[PDB]
Structure 1
Amino acid sequence: DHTIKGFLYQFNKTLNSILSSTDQDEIQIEGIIEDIDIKNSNITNAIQCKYHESKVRHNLSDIYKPILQMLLHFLENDSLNIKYALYAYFPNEQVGVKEVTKSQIEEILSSSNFDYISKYISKIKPPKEQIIKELLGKTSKTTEDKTRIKKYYETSKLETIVDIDKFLRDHFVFEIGLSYEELMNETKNLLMKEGFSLEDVKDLFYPNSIQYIAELSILPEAEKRISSKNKLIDYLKGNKKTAMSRWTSEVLTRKQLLKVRKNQLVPSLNINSRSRYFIIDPDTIDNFDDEFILFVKDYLDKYNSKIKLHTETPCFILKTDVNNLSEYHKRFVSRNIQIITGYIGDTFYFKEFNKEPKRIIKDNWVEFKARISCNSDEVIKCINYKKCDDLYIVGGVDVSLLDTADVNIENLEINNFRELKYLLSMLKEI
């Protein structure tokens, strides 16, 4: 349980650092240098997280290995402007920056542990004997070699290549961290300052952020572990918006939702001179064949009846084959409705589909009142050539090949022609 609590404390510290950083700061979760690597414009901040709730008092030996690792990294990267930080929590130690003296650092380098001497102290303090260097260079070290190295490092005085004074003065800082509960509360309060309420932070934002940190921690690739405050905020806001939409679309009945959609669509439908295209899937509307002609007749009677005012010809695109289009053309010509399909036989003609109808105002005559065709590639090229004002999609037809840039798209979720007529304001009440 202690390891899990330490991992949670490290994740909370990383989240707090992400929240407290600016938009220009790049932070690497489980960074190359330490647990938290904050990359600013000129200074890189490396923070090591240690949890010591079970320790009554802070001891120098508790921070031997981390300080040795930081010293080794500083020795290997002295030319880099990296600020090394050690974030360790102790229940009985006052929260704040704790100074580490040069004598304490020298005491760390004099530790009798063989692992530390072989890993970090040897590189910090190179041995002056070639035999000891060869022993340290062995991949596998026997017990006699370990004892010899330990005795040599305990008895011999070796110079320190690492500039301890400069490291402590500029590139090192030790801070006594807050408790796990206090750190979590501070992180939640930081989430509060981002416009998020306590309820939202407690329920959604904090667990999602913790899961995001945990997921980024286990990624083997270092580049994929780089995150930022803006990215986390955007991810949380997107999740919140999706949850809001999903939860809101569960209370209102069908009629209220349809009324809301109709009120949304009225302003665009009130304009006399807009080009409106409809993409319809016949299999999502009940009794499409028996009712399609009357629907088009009513639509033309409402929105394409005034010769002087209504200037734009509507277009209807259907997910069907050419033979059904010919049958619909027969049924339209039988009812004295003039349409154009762009098909002569089986071939499609560009210059027929896209021609503008001729008007004689005195005779109240328009050459054709609507365009009706199928969703073939040529027809979609015709649509893309002459971009429409409003593009209504009925039945979830694949719009992947249409150019939808700067085109107002209105997805209509209906299942019968009564609903479609109600949404387009051609009926007063269902």
Structure 2
Amino acid sequence: MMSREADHTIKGFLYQFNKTLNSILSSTDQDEIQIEGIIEDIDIKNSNITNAIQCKYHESKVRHNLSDIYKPILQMLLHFLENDSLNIKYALYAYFPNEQVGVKEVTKSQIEEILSSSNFDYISKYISKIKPPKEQIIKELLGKTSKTTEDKTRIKKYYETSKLETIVDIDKFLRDHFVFEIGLSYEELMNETKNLLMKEGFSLEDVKDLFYPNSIQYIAELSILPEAEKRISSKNKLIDYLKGNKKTAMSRWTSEVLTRKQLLKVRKNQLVPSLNINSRSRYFIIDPDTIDNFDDEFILFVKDYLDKYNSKIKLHTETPCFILKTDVNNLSEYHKRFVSRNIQIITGYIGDTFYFKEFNKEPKRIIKDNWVEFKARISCNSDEVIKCINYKKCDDLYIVGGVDVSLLDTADVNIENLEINNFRELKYLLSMLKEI
């Protein structure tokens, strides 16, 4: 039994995507959108909030069957019970092959007859919170961890019979904090979206794999910035061209499963051209607790990276470097776990003192044998190691998880943000794992 909060988050994400795509379609001149704004978090310092809306629809039906929009409206009213400060502009979006497109007749009576719902799930979830019962027995029954059939029947009879009021201003919610427009289904509008995007030069599959997800994410990221005044937009064609440049610039950070299998993929084919050069310097900035089972799998991942990218004695002349995000300690245990596996690394730390000359030395190698002094550099995220990294710049820098890229000069360095969940994903993105 999965938690309903995850399902609500999934529905909110689907609304975020479809509303963002609507804004992209309507982005012609001076849009100034405020897509989404609530992630069910603690701090709401800057509102920048549209709503936590959902888009649900059945297979096919002329009318809205029965008890269809009850879940979203109940959740919206419960959320409104703790809503204040700036107005939050609620909405509800849906598809119907044959229905009135636009605002529906929603003034007062609809909610009074929705509030007359008598479902056990609705009462247990949102009706009880919105309309508290007038009996201590019902209050005790609701708070019980386990409810029996007799308790549920008594509950249902009490709510159906007893007229229970509420303290939330319903009419205020209906007048402003709601709107319900029958829209179009964006699954079938993908072709039209591609056709509208197919107005510049671009390419056939480049829009599908590279441009559309980047536009969707960049527009969706317009409202996540801490500054609330960053949404100023005018002449949407010019900002569309700017996003055209930005999509080629970033070329990553895709959300949905578009063209992409397993858990993460499709970014693999873009990393291949860089991962095919022998004499290249690759620095990794890993953030542990962002990867599942990091302690027991980091060493194996390192071994499988070095037996593919640091095997050749004459062509692989660049030493990899893995800057983790931990304390100055906890490097001794990794060093011990590497020594036990016959892998030679250097940390640059003797106890707690860092040594500049011990971290920038080039490993002496002997070509008649297959000996290199050390095969990797592994250190923490301190300031001195970052200074060492800036002193000897890399060609590619891979950011795994969320790490502050500041204090790192990016003169001629290609930044490659890689979000992952486990080491199978990272192995698959680096072309050392054919399958998942």
Q: Given the two structures, how large is their TM-score scaled by the length of structure 2?
A: 0.45
Q: In 2 relative to 1, CA 144–43 (structure 1 residues): closer, same or farther, beyond 3 Å?
A: same
Distance 1:202 1:411, change over 3 A: closer
CA distance in 2: counterparts of 1:79 and 1:379, whole angstroms: 46
Q: Deviations over 1:71-116 (max 9, x none)?
A: 9999999999999999999999999999999999999999999999
Q: Structure 1 vs Structure 2: percent identity of aligned residues?
A: 100
8 Å CA contact 2:141, 2:151 repeated in 1: yes
Cα distance in 2 for partners of 1:286, 1:68 equals 36
1:384 Cα deviation after fit: 0.6
Distance 1:199 1:77, change over 3 A: same
Query: CA 1:130 to 1:209, structure 2 compared with 1: closer, same or farther past 3 Å?
Result: same
Q: Which whole-Å deviations, capped at 9, do the CAs of 1:112-155 have from their partners, x for residues lacking one?
A: 99999999999999999999999999999999999999999999
Of 341, 344, 347, the residue aligned with 1:338 is: 344
Distance 2:393 2:70 in 1: 70
**Deviation per residue, 1:145-197 (Å, 9 max, x gap):** 99999999999999999999999999999999999999999999999999999
Moved more, 110-119 or 321-330: 110-119
Distance 1:199 1:146, change over 3 A: same
Higher alpha-carbon deviation: 60-69 or 18-27: 60-69
Cα distance change of structure 1 residues 352 and 24 upon mapping to structure 2, 3 Å threshold: same
Q: Which has the larger displacement, 258-267 or 113-122?
A: 113-122
Q: 1:231 to 1:362 in 2, by over 3 A?
A: same
Counterpart Cα distance in 1 of 2:413 and 2:425: 24
Aligned residues: 430
After superposition, the C-alpha distances for 1:244-297 in whole angstroms (9 at most, x for unaligned) are 999974352752673311111111111111000000011111111111111111
Q: Residues 99 and 238 from structure 1, CA distance in 2 versus in 1: closer, same or farther, beyond 3 angstroms?
A: same
Q: Is the 8 A contact 1:27 1:36 kept in 2?
A: no
Residues 49 and 368 of structure 1: CA distance in aligned 2, closer, same or farther (over 3 Å): closer
- Cα RMSD (Å) of the superposition? 16.1
- Greater shift, 373-382 or 49-58, is seen at 49-58
Find the counterpart in structure 1 of residue 170 from structure 2.
164
- Gaps of at least 5 residues in structure 1 are none
Q: Any idea what the Cα deviations from partners look like across 1:5-55, whole Å, max 9, x if unmatched?
A: 999999999999999999999999999999999999999999999999999
> Structure 2 vs 1, CA of residues 252 and 365 (structure 1 numbering), >3 Å: closer, same or farther?
same
* In 1: Cα distance, 2:184 partner to 2:60 partner: 14
Instruction: Name the stretch that deviates more: 215-224 or 308-317.
Output: 215-224
Q: 1:137 to 1:291 in 2, by over 3 A?
A: closer
CA contact (8 A) 1:279 1:318 kept: yes
**Which deviates further from its counterpart, 52-61 or 186-195?**
52-61
| CA displacement at 1:395 relative to structure 2 | 0.8
SS of 1:257 mapped into structure 2: coil
- Indicate if the aligned counterparts of 2:37 and 2:224 stay in contact, CA closer than 8 A: no
SS, match of residue 248 in structure 1: coil
Cα distance change on mapping 1:231 and 1:406 into 2, 3 Å? farther
Instruction: Indicate if the aligned counterparts of 1:28 and 1:36 stay in contact, CA closer than 8 A.
Output: no
Is 1:175 aligned to residue 181 of structure 2? yes
Aligned to 1:320: 326
Does 207-216 or 311-320 show the bigger shift? 207-216
Label 1:215 to 1:246 Cα distance change in 2 as closer, same or farther (>3 A).
Answer: closer
Cα distance in 2 between the residues matched to 1:251 and 1:122: 37
Q: Which shifted more, 362-371 or 60-69?
A: 60-69
Q: Which runs of 5+ in 2 are unaligned?
A: 1-6
Which has the higher Rg, Structure 1 or Structure 2?
1
Q: Deviations over 1:349-393 (max 9, x none)?
A: 111101100010112110000000001000000111111011001
**Conserved in 1, the CA contact under 8 Å of 2:28 and 2:237?**
no
Q: How many angstroms apart in 2 are the aligned matches of 1:254 and 1:122?
A: 42
Moved more, 41-50 or 354-363: 41-50
Does the 8 Å CA contact 2:268/2:429 hold for their aligned counterparts? yes
Distance in 2 (alpha carbons) for counterparts of 1:247 and 1:229: 26
CA contact 1:279–1:317 (8 Å) conserved in 2: yes
Instruction: Give the superposition deviation at 1:322.
Output: 2.0
Greater share of strand residues, 1 or 2?
1
**Which secondary structure state, in structure 2, belongs to the residue aligned with residue 159 of structure 1?**
coil
Using the TM superposition, give the Cα deviation of residue 402 of structure 1 relative to its aligned residue in structure 2, in angstroms.
1.2
Moved more, 350-359 or 110-119: 110-119
Q: Indicate how the Cα distance of structure 1 residues 25 and 403 shifts in structure 2: closer, same or farther if over 3 A, else same.
A: same
Secondary structure, in 3 states, of the residue corresponding to 1:38?
A: coil
Contact 1:30 / 1:225 at 8 angstroms: preserved in 2?
no
Deviation larger for 318-327 or 84-93: 84-93
Task: Please state how far the C-alpha of 1:222 moved relative to its aligned partner.
Answer: 21
Deviates more, 1:304-313 or 1:3-12: 3-12
- Flag the 1:185–1:373 CA change in 2: closer, same or farther, 3 A: closer
Alignment partner, residue 159 of structure 2: 153
Contact 2:30–2:233 at 8 Å: present in 1 too? no
CA distance in 2, matches of 1:117, 1:419: 42
Q: Residue 210 of structure 1 corresponds to which residue in structure 2?
A: 216
Higher mean Cα deviation, 259-268 or 381-390? Answer: 259-268
Q: In the aligned structure 2, how far is the partner of 1:137 from the partner of 1:182?
A: 45
Shift in alpha-carbon separation, 1:352–1:238, aligned structure 2, 3 A:
same
Distance 1:21 1:137, change over 3 A: farther
Asked if the contact 2:272–2:431 (Cα under 8 Å) also holds between the matched residues in 1, the reply is yes
Tell me the TM-score normalised to structure 1 length: 0.46
Of 273, 278, 281, 1:275 maps to 281
Of 120-129 and 172-181, more deviation after overlay is shown by: 120-129
**Is the Cα contact below 8 Å between 1:72 and 1:120 reproduced in 2?**
yes
1:249 to 245, 255, 277: 255
CA distance in 2, matches of 1:151, 1:322: 64
Please say which of residues 276-285 and 160-169 is displaced more in the overlay: 160-169
Against the structure 1 CA distance between its residues 204 and 104, is the aligned structure 2 distance closer, same or farther, given a 3 Å change threshold? Answer: same
Determine whether 1:70 maps to 2:70: no
CA gap of 1:52–1:38, structure 2 versus 1, over 3 A, is: farther
SS at match of 2:118: coil
| Most deviating of 217-226 and 407-416 | 217-226
